[PDB]
Amino acid sequence: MDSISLRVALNDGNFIPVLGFGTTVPEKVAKDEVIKATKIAIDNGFRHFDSAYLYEVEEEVGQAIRSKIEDGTVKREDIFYTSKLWSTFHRPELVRTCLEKTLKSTQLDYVDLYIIHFPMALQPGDIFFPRDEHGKLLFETVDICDTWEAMEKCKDAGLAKSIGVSNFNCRQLERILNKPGLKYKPVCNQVECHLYLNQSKMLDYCKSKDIILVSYCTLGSSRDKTWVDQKSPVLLDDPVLCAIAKKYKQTPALVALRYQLQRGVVPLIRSFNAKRIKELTQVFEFQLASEDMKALDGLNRNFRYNNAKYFDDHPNHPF
Amino acid sequence: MDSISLRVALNDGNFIPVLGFGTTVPEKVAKDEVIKATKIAIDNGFRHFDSAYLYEVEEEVGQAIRSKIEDGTVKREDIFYTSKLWSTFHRPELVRTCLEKTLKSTQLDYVDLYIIHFPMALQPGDIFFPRDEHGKLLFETVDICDTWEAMEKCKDAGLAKSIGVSNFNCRQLERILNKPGLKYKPVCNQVECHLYLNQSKMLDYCKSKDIILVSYCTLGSSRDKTWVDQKSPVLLDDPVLCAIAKKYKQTPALVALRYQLQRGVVPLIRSFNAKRIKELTQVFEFQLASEDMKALDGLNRNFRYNNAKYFDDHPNHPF
Ligand SMILES: NC(=O)c1ccc[n+]([C@@H]2O[C@H](COP(=O)([O-])OP(=O)(O)OC[C@H]3O[C@@H](n4cnc5c(N)ncnc54)[C@H](OP(=O)(O)O)[C@@H]3O)[C@@H](O)[C@H]2O)c1
Ligand SMILES: NC(=O)c1ccc[n+]([C@@H]2O[C@H](COP(=O)([O-])OP(=O)(O)OC[C@H]3O[C@@H](n4cnc5c(N)ncnc54)[C@H](OP(=O)(O)O)[C@@H]3O)[C@@H](O)[C@H]2O)c1
Ligand SMILES: C[C@]12CC[C@H]3[C@@H](CCC4=CC(=O)CC[C@@]43C)[C@@H]1CC[C@@H]2O
Numbered sequence: 001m002d003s004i005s006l007r008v009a010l011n012d013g014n015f016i017p018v019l020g021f022g023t024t025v026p027e028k029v030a031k032d033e034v035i036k037a038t039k040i041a042i043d044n045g046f047r048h049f050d051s052a053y054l055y056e057v058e059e060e061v062g063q064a065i066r067s068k069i070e071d072g073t074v075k076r077e078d079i080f081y082t083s084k085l086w087s088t089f090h091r092p093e094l095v096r097t098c099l100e101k102t103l104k105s106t107q108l109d110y111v112d113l114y115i116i117h118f119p120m121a122l123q124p125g126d127i128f129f130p131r132d133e134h135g136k137l138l139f140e141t142v143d144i145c146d147t148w149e150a151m152e153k154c155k156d157a158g159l160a161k162s163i164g165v166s167n168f169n170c171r172q173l174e175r176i177l178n179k180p181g182l183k184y185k186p187v188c189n190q191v192e193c194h195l196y197l198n199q200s201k202m203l204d205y206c207k208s209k210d211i212i213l214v215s216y217c218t219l220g221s222s223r224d225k226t227w228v229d230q231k232s233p234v235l236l237d238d239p240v241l242c243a244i245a246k247k248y249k250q251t252p253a254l255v256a257l258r259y260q261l262q263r264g265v266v267p268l269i270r271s272f273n274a275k276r277i278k279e280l281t282q283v284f285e286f287q288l289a290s291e292d293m294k295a296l297d298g299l300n301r302n303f304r305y306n307n308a309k310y311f312d313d314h315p316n317h318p319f
Numbered sequence: 320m321d322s323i324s325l326r327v328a329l330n331d332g333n334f335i336p337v338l339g340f341g342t343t344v345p346e347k348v349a350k351d352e353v354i355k356a357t358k359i360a361i362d363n364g365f366r367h368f369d370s371a372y373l374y375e376v377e378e379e380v381g382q383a384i385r386s387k388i389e390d391g392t393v394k395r396e397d398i399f400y401t402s403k404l405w406s407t408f409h410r411p412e413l414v415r416t417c418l419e420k421t422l423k424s425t426q427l428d429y430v431d432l433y434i435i436h437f438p439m440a441l442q443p444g445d446i447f448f449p450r451d452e453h454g455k456l457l458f459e460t461v462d463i464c465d466t467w468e469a470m471e472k473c474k475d476a477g478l479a480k481s482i483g484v485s486n487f488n489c490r491q492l493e494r495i496l497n498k499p500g501l502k503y504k505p506v507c508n509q510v511e512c513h514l515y516l517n518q519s520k521m522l523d524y525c526k527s528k529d530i531i532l533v534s535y536c537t538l539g540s541s542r543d544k545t546w547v548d549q550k551s552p553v554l555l556d557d558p559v560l561c562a563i564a565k566k567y568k569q570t571p572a573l574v575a576l577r578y579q580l581q582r583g584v585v586p587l588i589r590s591f592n593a594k595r596i597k598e599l600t601q602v603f604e605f606q607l608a609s610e611d612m613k614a615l616d617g618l619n620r621n622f623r624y625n626n627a628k629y630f631d632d633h634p635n636h637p638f
């Protein structure tokens with residue numbers, strides 16, 4: 001069967017498809033394009049979809065998914081849908097409210113994985129990034145351990161099959177793992193990970209705790225100018241990556257992706273192009289040799305495309 | 320990660336690694352060879368091990384598995400162990416007794432999948448195939464539906480995560496699916512399936528019921544003279560199979576195996592040879608084209624290497 005549909009074990013007894021499909025829509029691209037791409041991803045064997053409250057497209061993604069359930073292509077159970085809790089709902093009493101909005105929007109009866117988008121709380125309200133009239137960002141110091149307890153209850157309530165975090169550093173992660181009364185451990189930490197920021201320490205830390213590293217910007221991001229510095233290196237053009245790709249008669253994208261899979265990372269990818277969507281499904285058809293992995297490991301330069309500078313000087317900034 | 324370690328969904332919410340490693344030891348081969356092979360299989364990414372009470376090697380296999388858990392190579396959760404209920408324990412009150420012997424032998428705290436080895440009951444006792452002094456096989460007519468209820472309780476008791484059957488024909492399968500009060504549906508039907516006996520009807524039946532077909536003798540069996548007719552065709556020598564293997568620069572074994580995976584079968588293989596064990600791990604590195612699948616589909620000749628003639632004329636003989 002579709003090898004990219006196959007699953008890996010989560011520490012709570014659940015299983016996640018090994019390859020995920022992101023749903024962020026680029027600034028100048030139309031939101032209906034995500035419906036097109038999602039249906040195509042499903043047709044190509046993609047069973048893991050990553051979204052978020054912040055993305056404002058959960059209505060569209062849920063629509064693409066249900067149409068495929070409707071026409072008998074898949075069952076809810078075949079789909080693994082991930083969503084994320086936004087910073088303005090970090091207050092314990094607001095966590096489930098955020099999730100219930102996602103459920104209402106997607107029309108799915110539960111999310112397979114619900115995660116904390118960032119370890120930073122912002123003032124409750126209707127704006128994603130609330131600032132005062134002088135531009136200061138209105139944040140709060142809600143303890144992650146408190147928001148985490150609210151996340152555990154959403155799992156107990158059956159609204160989320162699994163719970164995890166995103167953009168957490170080791171200190172923040174340790175804070176939750178050592179929390180007294182901890183009932184459910186985070187099943188993953190979704191962070192930026194690619195050839196220029198391979199996260200070997202975080203990967204080692206997660207392995208020792210049975211937490212999986214789910215990577216984003218795996219192919220060097222979408223270079224969306226609203227959030228990616230245009231003077232940053234283009235990952236897929238890297239000479240060493242292109243030489244190796246050439247050596248295996250594969251594309252750089254496939255080599256950048258395979259590298260992650262080979263090191264134990266569950267990667268997220270995104271393409272609104274039908275040829276490229278199909279192309280990524282062949283990542284299991286080859287295998288990098290030790291020497292080549294060591295080569296790619298050497299491309300690391302601790303470079304972030306996602307600095308989270310839109311969070312200004314939040315006392316809890318992970319980076 | 321090891322693509323042969325990846326999992327497929329079972330109809331009860333569990334997941335099974337896509338490629339299984341059998342543990343039967345050939346007549347003239349030493350039982351300690353299975354400990355060697357199992358450790359090597361684990362080192363190579365095999366996570367699904369198929370055994371049975373009848374095989375008399377559960378003590379050895381459990382030993383190989385635990386050593387790998389003990390040195391930190393895997394966790395119990397990483398391993399999927401299958402065992403089978405022997406015919407002499409078909410009486411409802413004896414089912415759990417058989418399972419508890421397996422648990423005691425393997426020293427695992429539960430089996431991931433427990434299945435009915437054959438749909439034929441034999442008289443209780445210490446001999447696998449009890450016969451009278453005149454030679455007649457001492458069988459019983461215990462209803463499979465009754466033994467099945469005993470299997471459901473072992474699942475409710477937590478002793479077996481999943482339950483299934485083996486060597487059942489469609490009638491016997493339908494008998495259980497239509498049983499009144501059925502609580503748990505069989506997650507699989509482990510039967511003989513290869514190029515000369517592809518089981519297309521059974522495969523279709525299973526697909527419609529969400530029952531997976533787990534195949535054995537996938538490579539044409541071990542040709543063990545105690546149970547395989549030496550005048551039977553050698554599957555891996557088949558001209559058409561060798562031509563196709565040649566066309567993909569792959570071995571016949573890999574082509575015989577890939578064919579099963581491509582049609583939705585979860586295959587079982589077995590090799591006590593370290594080179595061949597490693598060889599089978601590359602089955603995801605290529606893909607047969609439609610025309611080639613149709614070619615291989617044509618090799619079918621409804622030929623069984625496993626006639627179960629050791630069950631003589633049991634009224635419930637599946638074949
Ligand atoms: N948790 C967080 O804080 C966070 C942050 C950022 C992202 N994410 C997740 O990660 C997902 C992906 O992020 P991203 O889009 O910024 O990064 P990305 O996956 O690294 O890059 C996406 C870009 O790669 C291109 N691409 C896809 N397949 C390709 C192929 N085979 N060859 C060449 N190029 C290919 C796409 O172009 P085309 O469309 O033309 O194919 C697209 O522009 C997001 O949708 C989201 O779900 C999470
Ligand atoms: N449920 C049932 O009633 C039932 C019945 C029979 C079997 N089974 C299960 O199926 C498992 C396998 O059965 P089996 O051994 O009879 O049949 P099989 O898997 O079809 O054949 C095993 C033979 O194939 C050879 N082989 C393995 N890899 C090879 C490769 N890459 N190239 C060439 N040859 C290769 C092995 O030789 P080497 O060792 O030299 O590599 C071995 O002799 C059993 O252990 C058992 O778990 C279940
Ligand atoms: C920069 C931005 C806030 C942060 C967003 C970004 C879109 C992409 C994105 C995806 C994430 O999951 C993390 C937050 C970010 C990085 C948004 C585009 C406009 C908005 O102001």
Ligand SMILES: C[C@]12CC[C@H]3[C@@H](CCC4=CC(=O)CC[C@@]43C)[C@@H]1CC[C@@H]2O
Nearest residue numbers: 343371373436448543545546625627629
């Ligand atoms: C033939 C036999 C009983 C049936 C056994 C066979 C070993 C292989 C085997 C594996 C199975 O799982 C089904 C039963 C069989 C086919 C045994 C070897 C000696 C014994 O008498």
